[PDB]
């Protein structure tokens, strides 16, 4: 540390280096609930989490109960230990509440005043955050597994919806259009994800074992089908020997991660679909529904956090190296989300907990001359062989 501080003060190293090094060290030090609980509002499993992109203060949660909960993550108490309290909820008393489990919540990418929700009740809903009233509602023939709004598109406001139907659907919130379908897939579409680099490029994953990249401006059909063997454009390509149930672009958009029920994670070049041949080993993935997982941002290494049964596995994206297993939950983890500002990970599970994983690099320090106001050696940490 003191070396980094000296090098920064003297301009020997760019201020980038201390910042990225310490961010990486913090990710390596994640510990369960060290400073922080999250308030138990849900009665069911936590299907989905989304941290607000503007300030990172607020987290939406959706669950198998159909409830949507909005949490405040900032410690506005003066204590070193605190609870992330629920600001407000769309509970079962609300008229517009979802009838069946809520499978994706996403903030509007450009300000916090609106958010979107989807559910196995075959709806996509648009919510006014200040009032928690729906502004628009879209209905579908089939249960929605996933939806996404483009994180970078200013030009268009399209929601991609993946359903049990074989056709991807696109809803235009500006016009209210929901007629536009993409017709290339053959089974249920389990994950959809817009490129963070390009306004118009949508990745889609399906139980047909295919990941397809689309340019939604075109009348032409899809661009690229990912072939895990690298050899041919559509006739037989598969990304996994199983269902493909999760997508995550890397934070630069240059690669796409995919996870599937073959228990493998695979890294792809997003500009042409080449399998980069990074091998992570067995990544346990039994999930028959979409799996949400996340990369880090702003670290010296790009990490990926992936549900691994009841654990969260951490890998280095490019090296394939398994770094740690975060070992908290009692049932399968369904989502995790990364707070980029402070390198804190939140995780939802079918055990109904939301758990915070927080960098725990060192303890509060005593003064040895104190009587009892020290940083206490609690007797729970003591042996008792007598």
């Amino acid at each position: 540390m003191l070396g980094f501080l000296s090098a920064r003060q003297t301009g020997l190293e760019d201020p980038l280096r201390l910042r990225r090094a310490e961010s990486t060290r913090r990710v390596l030090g994640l510990e369960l609930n060290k400073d922080r609980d999250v308030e138990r509002i849900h009665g069911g499993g936590i299907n989905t989490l989304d941290i607000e992109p503007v300030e990172g203060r607020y987290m939406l949660s959706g669950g198998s109960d159909g409830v949507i909960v909005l949490y405040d993550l900032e410690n506005s108490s003066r204590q070193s230990y605190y609870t992330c309290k629920a600001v407000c909820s769309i509970g079962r008393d609300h008229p517009d509440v979802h009838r069946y489990s809520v499978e994706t919540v996403q903030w509007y990418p450009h300000d916090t005043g609106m958010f979107t929700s989807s559910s196995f009740d075959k709806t996509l809903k648009v919510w006014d955050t200040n009032t928690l009233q729906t502004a628009d509602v879209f209905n579908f023939e089939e249960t929605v597994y996933s939806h996404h709004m483009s994180p970078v598109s200013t030009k268009h406001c399209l929601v991609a919806v993946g359903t049990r139907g074989p056709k991807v659907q696109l809803c235009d919130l500006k016009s209210g259009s929901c007629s536009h379908i993409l017709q290339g897939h053959r089974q249920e579409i389990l994950a959809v994800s817009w490129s963070p680099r390009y306004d118009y490029i949508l990745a889609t994953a399906s139980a047909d074992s295919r990941v397809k990249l689309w340019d939604v401006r075109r009348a032409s059909g899809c661009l690229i089908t990912l072939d895990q063997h690298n050899g041919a454009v559509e006739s037989a390509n598969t990304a996994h020997n199983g269902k493909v149930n999760g997508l995550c672009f890397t934070s630069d958009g240059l690669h796409l991660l995919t996870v599937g029920t073959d228990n493998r994670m695979r890294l792809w070049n997003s500009s042409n679909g080449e399998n980069t041949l990074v091998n992570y080993g067995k990544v346990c993935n039994n999930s028959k529904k979409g799996l949400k997982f996340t990369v880090s941002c702003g670290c010296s290494s790009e990490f990926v956090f992936v549900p691994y049964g009841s654990t969260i596995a951490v890998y280095t994206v490019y090296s394939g190296e398994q770094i740690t297993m975060l070992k908290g939950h009692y049932k399968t983890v369904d989502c995790c989300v990364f707070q980029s500002n402070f390198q804190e990970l939140y995780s939802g599970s079918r055990d109904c907990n939301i758990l915070a994983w927080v960098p725990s690099l060192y303890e509060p320090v005593p003064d040895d001359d104190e009587t009892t106001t020290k940083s206490q050696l609690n007797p729970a940490f003591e042996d008792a062989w007598s």
Binding site: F4, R25, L28, A236, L277, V278, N279, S300
Partner: protein, 232 residues
């Protein structure tokens, strides 16, 4: 020495690994009719960085040193075979048989030029000029097996004998760990134990597979390497 090491708290080649594993293969058990097969899993037991292993294997494929074949008994079941063993054994098996000429054509044309695990009918018909009857000759020879209509895996003749012995041996050797006390067994003790009659391919070959497939965890101990069933 004084800054970069602070950034975070965190050599055998695939060619060497393949060449070592290839000697564990019991050639006489098959009257040498099979070319020696090493599984991709076993390579990861000697080259623990799976990414480096896979990339070096891909480069050996591009030099044409090795063939990768899908063995179908599991999703990841890839056999690694030296091209010259494969070519010699298949030509020796084809001598005077009715499918022989199509197999000579396949080994003279497709395999020198393609690394693929599978071929589609478009390539087979138009790029290599196979007649539909010649694909039938190749399937009779065992060099292809039907993947789907108009598509075929590259195959090894007689792979069923090996695959039978491997699948039963794998379950046997895994049960030797499962049944031993604590589900623990020291590797030196296992390799010293009289192998089951079910374990026909040999006991070291299987421990390298099991370790590479992550079916057993190695734990290091003062007593040496210890096998465990993984917490899974």
């Amino acid at each position: 020495h004084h800054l970069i090491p602070e950034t975070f708290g965190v050599p055998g080649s695939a060619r060497a690994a393949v060449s070592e594993l290839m000697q564990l293969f019991p050639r006489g058990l098959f009257e040498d009719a099979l070319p020696p097969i090493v599984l991709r899993s076993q390579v990861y037991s000697l080259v623990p960085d799976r990414t480096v292993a896979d990339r070096q294997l891909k480069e050996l494929q591009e030099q044409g040193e090795i063939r990768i074949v899908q063995l179908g008994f599991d999703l990841d079941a890839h056999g690694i075979i030296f091209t010259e063993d494969y070519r010699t054994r298949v030509l020796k098996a084809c001598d005077g048989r009715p499918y022989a000429g199509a197999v000579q054509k396949f080994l003279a044309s497709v395999l020198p030029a393609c690394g693929d695990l599978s071929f589609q009918q478009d390539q087979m018909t138009q790029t290599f000029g196979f007649r539909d009857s010649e694909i039938t000759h190749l399937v009779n020879a065992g060099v292809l097996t039907v993947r789907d209509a108009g598509s075929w895996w590259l195959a090894v003749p007689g792979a069923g004998r090996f695959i039978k012995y491997f699948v039963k041996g794998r379950q046997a050797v895994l049960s030797m760990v499962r049944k031993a006390k604590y589900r623990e067994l020291l590797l030196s003790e296992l390799l010293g134990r009289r192998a089951p009659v079910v374990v026909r391919l040999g006991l070291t070959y299987h421990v390298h597979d099991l370790i590479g497939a992550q079916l057993v965890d190695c734990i290091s101990t003062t007593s040496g390497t210890l096998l465990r069933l993984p917490e899974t």
